[PDB]
Design a protein around this ligand. Structure first.
Ligand SMILES: *[C@@H](C)[C@H]1/C(=C/c2[nH]c(/C=C3N=C(/C=C4\NC(=O)C(CC)=C4C)C(C)=C\3CCC(=O)O)c(CCC(=O)O)c2C)NC(=O)[C@@H]1C
Lengths: 172, 162, 162, 172, 162, 172, 172, 162, 162, 172, 162, 172
């Protein structure tokens, strides 16, 4: 896995060259906004169980066939597994946010996911909807102005939204 | 790659845990340090040539036989001097990568792992390289945390070669 | 237990290597945060009594049945109220340990591991404890980084219970 | 293992108490001197090779019986195993200085060492002599006033020397 | 799915052995008990509606707050009363499947496995379901071996929940 | 794997329904004839050695090329594996009779057998012949009127032949 | 492990003889009481949770030092282990009643327990008290005259108490 | 030791579960059958001396060279004849144990395991013993379930030798 | 296949090393012995027919019943005698392969592996083959090293059957 | 794997035949020139490091793109792996010469090498060039008339050449 | 310790087999070669002092700096020269051991394993030892097989250092 | 393990000495009488099964308590284990004759054998008696004057007896 720094170091090594000041300057901007990045990780993580459960409850209310006898989410074992999938995805999104790079998410989570669900019979489109619901909830939490130094996090918020979208498209 | 951000995520992942205050503190430490590391990488980059060319001359002075003896592993000719400068350039470049990443990771993966097999196979003496690293340590002209972090990577390579 | 210092040394040991700049940075992050964590722990310790008793009454208020229903798992008698206040004081004490250590380690070790079996066995509802934790969150009166850190451990426990 | 912090916490738990104010204040001066501790670790680590080779070369010059045929340091395998042991011990001493607690050293390194050497036929007093040679060298490096902000590190040098002494005494 | 027949074939298979008298004896015990089990299944099925609704009422009257408190995990509205009766029906259905199969297999498979993350995540109290099952035990009106076995499965669920 | 009971229970759950009185009556008939099923299992198992050796003997006599040097059953190791396969198929067929369902046979035995024989070069058509030979022998043993309470076992005999048939067809 | 039957068979083989009529007659009157034995097993098992929690609650009430900070049952991990230990002893105790022989209980449970506790620092006498409470509760349940064919279960009752006593001694 | 009761406990123990209605059914089967098994063991024990002498005689009749050929593995002398009748008595004793235990465990334990190595080393032929077992099958004179279970253990031994 | 050359290569490969003087010494032994071995293989091949027909009559004479008892496993008829001669021919052909390869490998792979399951299943006595092998050993008419090696392969087969 | 002897014995068994006098004569001429075969193995093995190192030096000089940044032999890890592969291929070739059969090289080395290199992105044609270089040096070393009893090894030289060629063809 | 005899016993022990003609053939090659090894070993032992002096001098002639440069790893003083002569002595002694044992075992075990770490740690060039070994090869004055086998161990050492 | 040659090399190394001309001579003699040694290995190995069966047959005749019900060699599992132990010891003795050193025998077979038997309850003294019988038979086979070049095998016979004697003493 790469973090924001090593990702650029790696592409530079393939050209066999040192980083250009322009490349370093981009890393500096990221270092300047790191406090906002850590706040977003802390806020999402601190509301993990809520984001997941509320998203899960909404999914099933909208798509009741998922939990009706015969549905992929019917029976305790499958429900538990479904809930676990939601939690895993959210966990990996927070990893990418913290590292500043999507590799860990793509590499250790989304890789082969679409195929996995196809083989299982798990509606991937339903997973995407669930991921979308978590995204909306997470972003609202990240953008709450209460108990935090006022400032702009729209950039970070846009990056966070990107990871949530990579996930949803990967199982769509 | 051994870097603060990468290791923090790795341990957490291996524990199947969400990130917590422990890992957020690792990030704080990396970002505090990045300020000097990034500037230090810029400095070294601007004086690369002078540093490389000077580290080489320093090696040739301590081991004058490396410019007189006949053989492919030596630099008595132009091919050899060029190879030598290239190798030192590689060492300096890996050091800057480490300042940028905030850890020995880039060096470990691109240079350290396997260096033993290489030196033995081509009959290259670790002593030659250690002398070049010593020269860069005393001539980079860095100060503060930038100097301290930079020297830690130079000394790390030296320790790997002895 | 899970703390920046222990974790850093453990990873290095597992890899059989000396500490490098990576682990030094982890330490920098821990020591930078220690200032606030230690002050927060001090504050919570001095306001413990009012905090415990207030969190208790808060629970009794959102769940009135807990005080009029007969049974050992309830607080209808003096014996039940005592056990409840004790339990709530445990969570708070663990939270101050986390602030001092700079990680969830203390809580993970002494409280979280096994909590599922206890609550199930003695029929204690995690909902009751979550309410108590929320109360402490809203009334500790801390500010700055002290509050953010304290709240992260309070929310950590809540998440461990839901 | 425990660090300076978890050590105090584990003791308070067995008593079921919160840390006293005076104790917390103590952990404060400790956090105040942290920069000196980290330089200490960085300096020893950066000279690990010199400390070990010089100490070893000196030990062998003083006890040539160790490297003479039939000696415990005779043959490449045994010499290498010997150098490794000095490196390992040095490594754990630096872990202890970093964590601010001796537990990692005692538990993962010193535990049962004396017995191991007795079984192997390795002379612990010679190992102790080697640990002492490393201590002298490590302290000289930590105390070197060159290229560092001036200040007092006597309390640190004192704590560091104590870990080296625990080691020497554990094999003796 | 643990049932006398499947388990027997499983042990034999794992030993690479043909079935022997031991397994034939397992089959005798299952077919002997099936007579009682098939009748009980028939009986519970016919009194299902009455048992489910009656059990839901017993629980509401035992834990009055379940119809008073607001929240998705409670029955303060029709949606929650419907979900609750549904859940109780799931337990009754699993119990008749066990009687038919001769083992807890079906309940283990479709209900027990994972019930913990479910109740924790949705804040559903095990004691509510325990009360429902106790009501069914006291009202199915079965007798003899049919009742003994039925109650063994109702009690199995109660133990899995406590 | 399923037995006769869990097979019906599994389909019912998929529809979220309780077994119908019709279904419970069917399962009741099976319980009624259970003594006969256990007899058939005891009789076949009790003569496994005889059923296999005689079938093999007969198969080699009819297909001599199988044992000529270079033939798939030539050499000690290949003959022993062949005899083992016959025994394995018989064992799994008896498992299916005891359980009243063919899943154990299909799943743990016949699954991918055709492709295994295809990769080794083992003629599946010859394996089918051996199976058919074991079938005729097994059925004769089951239907033997000697030393057993007289009654009709035709249905059973038919269910048993079906299992041998599935096997023979899976390797052909 | 042995059951009532193989236990007698094993002692007979070392003597090289077949069971005497007396030996067979004894096993016979045991087979006659098998219904009561299976009821006692079913009853205790059906009330496992109650038996364990009520016994533990009662033990901690009269031995508070066990749950006070520093006590061996203090902290969740340890309380969980303690509850588990009691459930485990009850489980093996029920195995013994079912098989009609104490070997499974001795071989797989009690064996080593006294020493593993002593090494752990766990009080054996306290555990013995908890086992005794479980015994009281267990026998009251087996002896409940409600909803069961009336008859004498006194002999069985003593056998059970015996296994419980075996357990209490093994650690006390 | 393969027997209904020990295997039921064994399987459950391996799964870490309390016994359930499945294992209870396994016991009902063992006890329904024990009535016939203990009666068979009694009978066989009574006819032992005759069954052993008759079986040994049947072997010699089928393989006369065994009573003629010189060699320690044969029965040309009294020594060999005594060893032979002793071995046959072992098989018969093992069969009665199986009926008492209700499974093949005793025979597997004391006789089947290692039998191949013995027969090869001492050059004893499996065919001889098979003949002996066939004789006991046709002459024990048991009836009903007693005969069926007894014959299952004799055929089991026969299958082990072929 | 166990041969001096293949084993030398195998141990080297397992240890990940080039062939050293140890493995070259192994080959020296192989090629030195090969002269006698190849000579022996030729000798036996020419006497094949008489060695086989002779060993066969040697078995029939030692165990007269094998030519009298009716049954598929015996040689009372032409079919059985042909099977027997064939089997003895197999053992001899394997012996010449061993002499040619310089090891037991050919016999282990094509004949010894699984021979026990075959003799048991088809009720063929190992003693019959041991007798045939003893005959060949006493009649090949070889001498010198050729006889010592040839005999060692015949004795190896005898040991595998007893 | 086969050696020169068991290869023939293998073909013979499939036809169920004993070796002809002619076949034995051929195996005879092989034993006759065995000393030469052993010298070639000893000579190539005794110069292994020189053959590999010189072949690599020459390969990299003819194809500098391999050691340029981004190249498959760039970075110490990749260079060490490259030299390792050449040593491995040379080792397996000497095993083949020793055994007098290629089975060992084909089975344990070449099999599935193309794809492995294709998956890694390693240029198989470059590996073949390196192999061709090792062949040249090996044969020269084998045919050096110094310090050896004069004789004709031309037949051997071609056998050795064939193995190197077989290897080069397997990767490119 | 790798020698023809211990390796033959090892491959056989690992397979749980008795020694066979393959291992005896290994022994034959070993005892055949022993004649040359014993002679080479005795000869080298009588020329030891002469070979050690000439070898050391050969290294000094080839790498003159080793006698001028300062450092404990160099031979510019009597101390260093003595160490060098001693090391060379060890190499020659190991070689005679290999000739006596018929394998690289003695050298692999007493010298080769760990040599890498030693040369790196004490800053000794493998190249110095390779030249000393080349000298011994050119000056031992052995002939025939004695020379061939002796040179194979010298070259083996050379390959371990390059 | 050591063989005759490495045993001497190991002793010489600890003293840092090259082998003396006397030691070279001693080894030379060993090499000279080596054909005799190989014959002894071939002869014992070739009669392995009859040496074990006859020694076993004779042991049980002299000590009937061993095969009587309840005896350590009673039951097939135990008798087979007994026969295997005798074969295992014979195998290791032949290894030592082949190697010319007892280390392999002492190290991989006799080490810890007495304790094993003590724990199992196996009479080591009876094993020692069985070993003695194997010695008798093995020496008779080695000393057989037929079909071999005449010569004195005195010394060897004495060495062989010495290994058997070591085995007997290790469990006596
Ligand atoms: C073509 C490859 C070259 C060549 C070879 C050649 N060699 C021999 C003879 C021998 N080679 C050995 C080998 C060894 N002796 C040892 O002690 C060791 C170390 C363990 C080895 C590898 C031996 C013993 C001989 C025979 C004795 C001798 O030296 O002559 C021959 C002669 C033919 C033969 O088979 O004896 C030949 C032709 N000759 C060349 O011209 C090519 C350069």
């Amino acid at each position: 896995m790469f973090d924001a720094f090593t990702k650029v170091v790696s592409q530079a090594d393939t050209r066999g060259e040192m980083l250009s000041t322009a490349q370093i300057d981009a890393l500096s901007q990221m270092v300047a906004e790191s406090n906002k990045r850590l706040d977003v990780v802390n806020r999402i993580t601190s509301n993990a169980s809520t984001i997941v459960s509320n998203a899960a409850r909404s999914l099933f209310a909208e798509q009741p066939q998922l939990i009706a006898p015969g549905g992929n989410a019917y029976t305790s074992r499958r429900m538990a597994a479904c809930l676990r999938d939601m939690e895993i995805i959210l966990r990996y999104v927070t990893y990418a946010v913290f590292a500043g790079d999507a590799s860990v998410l793509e590499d250790r989570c989304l890789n082969g996911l679409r195929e996995t669900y196809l083989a299982l019979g798990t509606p991937g489109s339903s997973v995407a909807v669930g991921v979308g619901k978590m995204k909306e909830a997470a972003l609202a939490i990240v953008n709450d102005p209460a108990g935090i130094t006022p400032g702009d996090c729209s950039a970070l918020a846009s990056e966070i939204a990107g990871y949530f979208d990579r996930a949803a498209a990967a199982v769509s | 790659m051994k870097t603060p951000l990468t290791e923090a995520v790795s341990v957490a992942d291996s524990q199947g845990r969400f990130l917590s205050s422990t890992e957020i503190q690792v990030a704080f430490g990396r970002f505090r340090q990045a300020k000097a590391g990034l500037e230090a990488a810029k400095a070294l980059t601007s004086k690369a040539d002078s540093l490389i060319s000077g580290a080489a001359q320093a090696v040739y002075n301590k081991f004058p036989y490396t410019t007189q003896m006949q053989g492919p592993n030596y630099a008595a000719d132009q091919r050899g001097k060029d190879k030598c400068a290239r190798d030192i350039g590689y060492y300096l470049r890996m050091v800057t990568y480490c300042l940028i990443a905030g850890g020995t990771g880039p060096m470990d993966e691109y240079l350290i792992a396997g260096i033993d097999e290489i030196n033995r196979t081509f009959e290259l003496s670790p002593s030659w390289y250690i002398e070049a690293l010593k020269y860069i340590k005393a001539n980079h002209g860095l100060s503060g945390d930038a100097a301290v972090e930079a020297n830690s990577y130079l000394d790390y390579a030296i320790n790997a070669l002895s």
